Ligand binder design. Structure first.
Ligand SMILES: [Mg+2]
Ligand SMILES: [Mg+2]
Ligand SMILES: [Mg+2]
Ligand SMILES: [Mg+2]
Ligand SMILES: [Mg+2]
Ligand SMILES: [Mg+2]
Ligand SMILES: [Mg+2]
Ligand SMILES: [Mg+2]
Ligand SMILES: [Mg+2]
Ligand SMILES: [Mg+2]
Ligand SMILES: [Mg+2]
Ligand SMILES: [Mg+2]
Ligand SMILES: [Zn+2]
Ligand SMILES: [Zn+2]
Lengths: 100, 68, 55, 96, 114
RNA sequence: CGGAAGGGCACCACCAGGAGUGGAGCCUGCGGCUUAAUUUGACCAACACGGGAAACCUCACCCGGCCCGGACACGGACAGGAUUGACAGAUUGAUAGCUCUUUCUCGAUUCCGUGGGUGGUGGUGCAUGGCCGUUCUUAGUUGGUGGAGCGAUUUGUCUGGUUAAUUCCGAUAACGAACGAGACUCUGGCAUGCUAACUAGUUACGCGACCCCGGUCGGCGUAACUUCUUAGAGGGACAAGUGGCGUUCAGCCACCCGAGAUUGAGCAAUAACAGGUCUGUGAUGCCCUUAGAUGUCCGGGGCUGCACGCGCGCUACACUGACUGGCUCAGCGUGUGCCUACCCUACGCCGGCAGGCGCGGGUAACCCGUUGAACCCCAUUCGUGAUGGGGAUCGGGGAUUGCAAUUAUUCCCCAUGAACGAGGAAUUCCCAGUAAGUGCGGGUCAUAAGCUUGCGUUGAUUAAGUCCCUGCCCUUUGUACACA
């Protein structure tokens, strides 16, 4: 009944498109839905030396990865959940469907 | 680069000519008489021989030592 | 016996146990986030991993 | 390599039942993951398929730490003639 | 999955997956005009699209080499059997791919002209 | 290019200053010395650099001892053996069958001679790729058409003004342009307007506790909502308005209204250097070694060694201070790892302490955690004394990590109590939430920050200029250099 899907991604545009597409599917099937809740973004940050050897001006990079997690709540049987989730998913977004 | 001490040679292991015939004895009747002993352990049960040394017995595979 | 001491030093910690997963190098490893790769190879494959200098 | 007959047969039968085999470049692996029941350490795997490479039976490429080996056709007929097999049965990379 | 690995090292591990896989297919398919991969990772399915120039050459006779490449990828990464499928696709306007033209120029130079 | 001239720019330059360094103790790097070895690269753009905090490993150096992990091809020895292993006793350091003696094996894998390899942190970065540093993050660079010249070339790219800027304006044989700059991306700020939320909260409501209707509660449950929290789409500032200065141009200064009237970084380029890296590599040519190995392993040692000199920093020299109680506030983050063996911790007992033993939470806006961080603030003690400043050196003990701490890994307790009284010549960095003080995360990590990379907090003096010094750039000039 109280299904809860979680969408992790590295991109922002694709993830907003996926979650908006899923709530459009839930609106078309006319379901009560909780809005797309945004978790705070994770910024994986690695600071390495640019130089392979040791000499130079001490120059550092700032490589960062961003992880965006948006999650949705729906109220439907499992068949509806499988039918909506099995369609329309962008290749970069990773999905986790929890039940309770 | 040069060395001082002479080298430690490899152990040139001694070849034994017809080692299986030294286990048994020849009789003019067709019966088998075994000279030296046998190892009783698990995977090497019934025909696996032991080493006959000057002061004790030994089998390699399971490391069995029969002291006197 | 030889195979009883051939690799018998405990590699349970320390720099000699862990290594780069591209070079098998032992110098400048990032073990943060489970990279386990040397810093030159992380600079090489950062855009392939996903780490980008947005800033 | 002083490899056992049984370990070499294990190597050749996995290589002939699937046409490829992979291996992390590690002498100091205890025991090989992709065929892990009859013992065959990764040392035995690496040096056996090095002997298979050197007389032109298998093809080798290397990505970061892993050997990847592809069995060629003259390697197929060699490994069949070694393992004493009928000419119908093939590796999985050949049949559909 | 009861191993339940964190998301931070999860995305890092997927990135290292694509990095090792990109360099592996780079050393394999450089004669074919390999330009890259895109992994469409479904749950319970995994499509992995190779983008190159000579797709017949990367596919092989009866598709043999793409079969053994699928077997190599699955056996190296420990995937379930039949979970992944490789796919050869030809890049559009292969002149405008800097990677494929660099590989072409590489094979021309080791061909030996000026 | 100049050991010429003239313009310009810059807190890696100066002026006004601030905090310093250089003086002392210690940390750590470099040279020297010493040594079995105290390996090595680098010497503005080397010197707390190689992400280099080395007990082992790392590890390349030294002293000893194992292994082949010498593929494949050829030729010999033979299931009347090719030969791998092998516990006693010697021996060794070692339970290395390494060697010596002795004998059991193992089920053609092999061994022995020869080609041929292969491996290497071995040499060469003055053979090389890639990457990086520098010139310089300065402002420099280039065609098309049109002038000049026989031509190489030149003007455009400028006398000036202005700008952070070859940024524009404006003169003008040039006119239209591209790269750089700028624009762009990430970030900080502002939205009571939008989107949304039991993994964030507020306000009410009802119980519960306590104090004398009301007050407090991160005590407990639910009705609205999104101000606070989170993050998406938008919007928002452009010198827009006013007044001066200036061809009235480019622009500059001041002020209103305003969340802001220069937020900070990333990317950064015709070119060069015989700058660095062959010790990041299964990137690599050539050379060298390749079985008594420079391959690889194991054991020990060294990389720490101390008459000296230099560099990066930490602690301080105290009363604006120290000590002891008391009160009260954060933001970055990270957290159970493929191999891979090692996670952050609440809460409860024991102990002064470091710590030890129990059950629990957490793959994380869910648990540590409302991260009760320091400095700061409040109240004592001190009293100008190398004193309760300072905490080096050194002794005795107690815990943790690890296979192992001795040359003391670290931490704790007691005692010892050194120079140091504000640092000569010289010299570093910086202008707004900046410097400086202060603590906290990350990396390295079994143990672990005197380092580096980030984060917050408390938060200024001075300046809104210049070419005087040091740098570099442009123009002109000179050249017999042009591998300059
Ligand atoms: Mg290292
Ligand atoms: Mg300056
Ligand atoms: Mg010295
Ligand atoms: Mg080591
Ligand atoms: Mg080395
Ligand atoms: Mg070896
Ligand atoms: Mg190669
Ligand atoms: Mg070795
Ligand atoms: Mg004193
Ligand atoms: Mg002492
Ligand atoms: Mg100076
Ligand atoms: Mg002259
Ligand atoms: Zn036995
Ligand atoms: Zn690497």
């Amino acid at each position: 009944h109280r299904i809860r899907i979680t969408l992790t991604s590295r991109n922002v545009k694709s993830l907003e498109k996926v979650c908006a597409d899923l709530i459009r599917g839930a609106k078309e099937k006319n379901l009560k839905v909780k809005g797309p809740v945004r978790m705070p973004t994770k910024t994986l940050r690695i600071t390495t030396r640019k130089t392979p050897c040791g000499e130079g001006s001490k120059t550092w990079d700032r490589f960062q990865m961003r992880i965006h997690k948006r999650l949705i709540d729906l109220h439907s049987p499992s068949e509806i959940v499988k039918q909506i989730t099995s369609i329309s998913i962008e290749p970069g977004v990773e999905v986790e469907v929890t039940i309770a | 680069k040069s060395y001082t001490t002479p080298k430690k040679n490899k152990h040139k292991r001694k070849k034994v000519k017809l080692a299986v015939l030294k286990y048994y004895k020849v009789d003019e009747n067709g019966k088998i008489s075994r000279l030296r002993r046998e190892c009783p352990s698990d995977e090497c049960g019934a025909g696996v021989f032991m080493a006959s040394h000057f002061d004790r017995h030994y089998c390699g595979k399971c490391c069995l030592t029969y002291c006197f | 016996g030889h195979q009883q001491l051939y690799w018998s030093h405990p590699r349970k910690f320390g720099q000699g146990s862990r290594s780069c997963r591209v070079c098998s190098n032992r110098h400048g490893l990032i073990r943060k986030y489970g990279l386990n790769m040397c810093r030159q190879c992380f600079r090489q494959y950062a855009k392939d991993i996903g780490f980008i200098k947005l800033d | 390599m002083l490899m056992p007959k049984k370990n070499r047969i294990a190597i050749y039968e996995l290589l002939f039942k699937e046409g490829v085999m992979v291996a992390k470049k590690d002498v100091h692996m205890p025991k090989h993951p992709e065929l892990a029941d009859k013992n065959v350490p990764n040392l035995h795997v690496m040096k056996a398929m090095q002997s298979l490479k050197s007389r032109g039976y298998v093809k080798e490429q290397f990505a970061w730490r892993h050997f990847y080996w592809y069995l060629t056709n003259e390697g197929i007929q060699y490994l069949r003639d070694y393992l004493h097999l009928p000419p119908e049965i093939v590796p999985a990379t050949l049949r559909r | 999955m009861a191993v339940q690995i964190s998301k931070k090292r999860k995305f890092v591990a997927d990135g290292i997956f694509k990095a090792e896989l990109n360099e592996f297919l780079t050393r394999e398919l450089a004669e074919d005009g390999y330009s890259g991969v895109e992994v469409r990772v479904t749950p319970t399915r995994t499509e992995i699209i190779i983008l190159a120039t000579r797709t017949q050459n990367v596919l092989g006779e009866k598709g043999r080499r793409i079969r053994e490449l699928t077997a190599v990828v699955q056996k190296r990464f420990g995937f379930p059997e039949g979970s992944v499928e490789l796919y050869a696709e030809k890049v559009a306007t292969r002149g405008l791919c800097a990677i494929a033209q660099a590989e072409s120029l590489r094979y021309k130079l080791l061909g030996g002209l000026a």
